[PDB]
Amino acid sequence: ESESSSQGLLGYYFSDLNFQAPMVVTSSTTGDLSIPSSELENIPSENQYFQSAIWSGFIKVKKSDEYTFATSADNHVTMWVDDQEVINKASNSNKIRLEKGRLYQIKIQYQRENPTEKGLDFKLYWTDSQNKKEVISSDNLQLPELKQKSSNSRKKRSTSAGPTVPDRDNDGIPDSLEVEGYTVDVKNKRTFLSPWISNIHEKKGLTKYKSSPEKWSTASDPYSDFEKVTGRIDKNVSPEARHPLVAAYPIVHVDMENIILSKNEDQSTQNTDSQTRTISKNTSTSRTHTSAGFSNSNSSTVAIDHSLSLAGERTWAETMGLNTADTARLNANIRYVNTGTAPIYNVLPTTSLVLGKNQTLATIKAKENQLSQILAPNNYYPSKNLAPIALNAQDDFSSTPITMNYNQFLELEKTKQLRLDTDQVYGNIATYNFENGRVRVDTGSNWSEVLPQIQETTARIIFNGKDLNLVERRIAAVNPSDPLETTKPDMTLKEALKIAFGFNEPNGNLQYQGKDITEFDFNFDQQTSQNIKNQLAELNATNIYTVLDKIKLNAKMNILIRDKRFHYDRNNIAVGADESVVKEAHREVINSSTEGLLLNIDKDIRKILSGYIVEIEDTEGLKEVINDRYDMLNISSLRQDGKTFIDFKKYNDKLPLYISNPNYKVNVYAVTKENTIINPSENGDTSTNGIKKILIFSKKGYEI
Ligand SMILES: [Ca+2]
Ligand SMILES: [Ca+2]
Hints:
One of its GO terms (molecular function) is toxin activity. One of its GO terms (biological process) is protein homooligomerization. Keywords: Calcium, Cleavage on pair of basic residues, Host cell membrane, Host endosome, Host membrane, Membrane, Metal-binding, Plasmid, Secreted, Signal, Toxin, Transmembrane, Transmembrane beta strand, Virulence. The chain is mainly β. The chain is built from 11 helices and 41 strands. It binds calcium ion (2 copies).
């Protein structure tokens, strides 16, 4: 019913007599082309008088016959079928032969000076050979072909015999409206596109669009400006990318969830009758950005848990029974992650699993055209309700083993890191088809044909506000040296943040989910930095935060915006926070006992804590660390209710702390990721000696 509702003829309704001032652009499913004044609340009363109209599209017939076309105002109408004039400023009985299976272009013009009624009552009729006259049915009428090229059956542009609205890029939105501003509103389920009128639309909370009249897609993506704003688009496209100035494209990385390491079989020896020795660790994977930088590459970095998971757990090699001359195997569970704004249907990108700088251990591919589901934006493949992908799947005889020699295994143990480099080959695009009003995967449309143009013509902003993960958006922005890109509207930094990331402005302060813009930092590549510095000098402005509405974005800018609470590594991953931030986040304790601490810790702060150290201090100052090992600091868990429990029993032989004198102190320290030790020291010290830690709790026994 949604698909059907958006098919039919396309109409342009003008306040002036000569097709210059479009007030409404909208389609009609039938030959009833009326718009009653009841549906015009977003149009000034003065402009609700329509002195002209043009309709365009196609007509198909179910049965070959002679037809006679009629309107409700033939004295005011000229109509064309293909190039043949069939009505002209008077009624008539002239017949026209139409064959079944063929498509005929329809153009109708209407002009009436000084109508006494607002809106337009207008119907298109035909009469067949059996003299039965009827308003043209929905099954017979189709939209114009508002694409960059013609189809086999449907011409892209209309007859020049009749008048034409200026629409240089053939998206359907008149030149003037794209430049001056327009909005869309639904009234009784129809989408009306109208000129932006500030003193009506602003307070109704309608969205002001501007777009290039020379770019069918102003963001250089595969969906037209008209398709976006009228909902004639893949429903999987992100809400923000329904704006003509926000690019719709996939962005993919691979998330590794866990890893399992084992000894490889060798020809010289035969597997014994015994349970295979494996070491199994959770992994944490983040999409990275190396700075902003220019690189548009997809990469994620995997951190392998360095903490114990099993009581009396031995070293990796002892656990695997891996000796110096042996080879190790790796398996892992993964999912693909789409952090972009458009879906993938039939080609997942190839990924390299890399040890160190450039030792490729594995190539990970999916079968083209055999995906089990769509990889939607803000989502995963497989979906999180389904099992992940194993790199070597059960009974997959064709899955290549992933092996490391002994020295590579030592390198993996030393770094506890892997990298997943993913290409940008994403396959075919689901596009809208004006002939049937459907969205389907289009064998003729491919992401590789638009990604470079998106990357060349937009400003990139990378923002970590949602959950400290790096999210990229691209916003259409002028390139002063490229005439086609200078036809685009001005884009301010403030506006880009609103439209691309959903910043809002309730009390005249720009914020994201309750956090003021000043709680995030700004970083730019070298060229972007110089550009903005120059803009600020021209504005006589010394603080970027107070003039975000005046800083203009340009194509090929790179802007990185991060939560100021955190310390970041070279990949722009959050790895710590200042001492006082950490201390403050642990200040409110709900309960303390000899079994542990229960408290409420902000979810973002928790992401940069790797461990806690528990210590008993005597009345003379000697300190005993209870969990005195670099791999025994994983004592924090998040409960069902979102509270954090720091467990004193876990590495105290499952017993509450014994406090042999109530004036003794229990001190607890937090260790941030930045400061986390992941191996014994050079001299083999496995203790917590020298670990840079932050005191977050200290109480005497009688206080607990
Ligand atoms: Ca246009
Ligand atoms: Ca356009």
